[PDB]
Symmetry: D2
């Protein structure tokens, strides 16, 4: 059975970038619901699979991809976030990653601008990702609850669903993107970039 | 002149839909979200005028997302304000839609059964989108559209409900089910009847 | 166990639908295309069984496209063969579907008007897909599905027409309008009536 | 507005045999591509009215026709130019020095590139195209669905049409044999000019 992962920090640890109210609702309400609906969908699909019930399996695909994708995405999200005062929020905790970032985009600032443009370009709900595809780095977006497709390894992701910022920033998603860089966990991003 | 759309005034004050929809949501939804759609729509249409005259198909294709999203949201929200009214108004009474409710009961069994089917479609939207009651010929149908897409050609919208998180989050938080439960009290059946007929 | 689907036999010989659909098309469509959908559906379902036992959600999501496409095409083509019959058969006469044709004329005005609306939807499909007459509750509706998608849950298919290019190209080349014109002669209205009822 | 024309082929209809039959080449160019050009012109002329009339619902409804027919006009125009007789020096991979160098740099070799491209081509569900594109300085294999053109930011180097009408008359359901034989008629000279300029 899948479970809601515990946060590595308190609900207010990401302030003033992300409010404590958003963090508590995002984790204890939104993410918690994805886990519940994922387990419910998988149990129903198990019956349809054994019964060779293809129509029911097709009907359950949306629930498994959405809730399974959001559970994957939010689990990554909490781990590539950290308090702004921690050394893990310093990009110097990611020597190899930032080196490849500067090789691909020119500089860290240029990468942040391109990432921000992709994040703000999402129409509706979705996520923005820095992913590793082969040996290079790439900025991709995913719609709704879709996870990153097979072949791209997520380095870090930023949730652009309105529930990720609306209570604090209202419709001003640009301010949310500008301020979220202060709480990006570059230690986790370096760990994912290197892999094993 | 191309790209001369404007933000339409609400048929009511910002607090007229309380307690179903808060004045804070109505003001932000209308004066910020809808206004931004109008602005981005006009700019996109003006750029398209140049690409169309120059027979620039690549530029025309690239501008389609902005026109469908901002033009659709301008269409959808303009319809939205008009199929909403204060809960104490006679237009909020389903008896203001004799022909519509008659077809609703013939199609779903009852108004309550239709409300249950509409609610499941609204709450079933993954991500951002709208839920609609549409007219196709003589029958009625419940459809959903994603993001800012408008209802496709051939189906005539009767009324719509915005399921974007900005439509309820400040008041209802993650409780979108409660938002749908309370929005039935402010549905303008008089407007829905006029569109149906 | 998991993944034990088989290719259903045709209700008629490969040349039984001529001159509407050629014997070469019928044999290739059934023994090659449909057989491939059945095989790839079984393989996808067996691979999913492995991913499910391993609690591998990413692998499960990756397999969804293969299951929907091959499972949908297996459902769609199985329906397709059943709503086709020789033009000289009594099942090919629209009088074999009294209740269906009555609702068709009530919804579109006449059978010819319905054929006009169905043909435009069929010819309007961009790329590969199907056109369907479906039952949604008590009403009738014309819908299209893309690639191998089946009709969504809630709509009951009455009959379908395959608009993939492989369904007509060998006989009609790019003239899909002639393909639609001639396929009405081999529609099995008896099966369509049974599905409607 | 909307005055596009069908481009003439650089060769006779039978010049690509035995890889692509003369019957396919004539139908593909004189029938399929010509219809894309015509329907692109019709959509652009209709859009001029909707644009001047500020008819956003009609403009959104016309987007599919403009992207589909405009994309297919772009795709097929590129297609004819990256095809040439197998006996031509342009069919030899040495005609694209800068291009073929990056191909071996990105995939390892030309054969490795053909294996990856073929899998992408055969993996398309329904109708679509497979492309080798240049993004910045690197190369990538991408696919486009139905009539979509290559996205902005990627420069098409050459494309292979995987619509069933591109091979069905000659290869039937064997799209794998179609991909295997089309490598003999790829015009690397045009692919080099697109890669550089
Ligand atoms: Mn979220
Ligand atoms: Mn809205
Ligand atoms: Mn078929
Ligand atoms: Mn083609």
């Amino acid at each position: 059975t899948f479970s809601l992962p515990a946060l590595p920090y308190a609900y207010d640890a990401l302030e003033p970038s992300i409010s404590a109210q958003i963090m508590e609702l995002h984790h204890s309400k939104h993410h918690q619901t994805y886990v519940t609906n994922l387990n419910n969908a998988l149990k129903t699909y198990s019956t349809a699979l054994a019964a060779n019930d293809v129509p029911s399996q097709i009907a359950l695909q949306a629930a498994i991809k959405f809730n399974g994708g959001q559970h994957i995405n939010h689990s990554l999200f909490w781990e590539n976030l950290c308090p702004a005062s921690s050394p893990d929020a310093d990009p110097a905790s990611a020597p190899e990653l930032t080196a490849e970032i500067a090789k691909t985009w020119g500089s860290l600032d240029k990468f942040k601008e391109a990432m921000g443009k992709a994040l703000l370009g999402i129409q509706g709900s979705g996520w923005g990702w820095l992913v590793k595809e082969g040996s290079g780095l790439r900025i991709v977006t995913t719609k709704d609850g879709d996870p990153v497709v097979g072949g791209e390894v997520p380095v870090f992701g930023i949730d652009m669903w309105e529930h990720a910022y609306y209570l604090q920033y209202l419709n001003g998603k640009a301010a949310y993107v500008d301020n979220i860089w202060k709480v990006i966990n570059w230690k986790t991003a370096e760990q994912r970039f290197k892999g094993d």
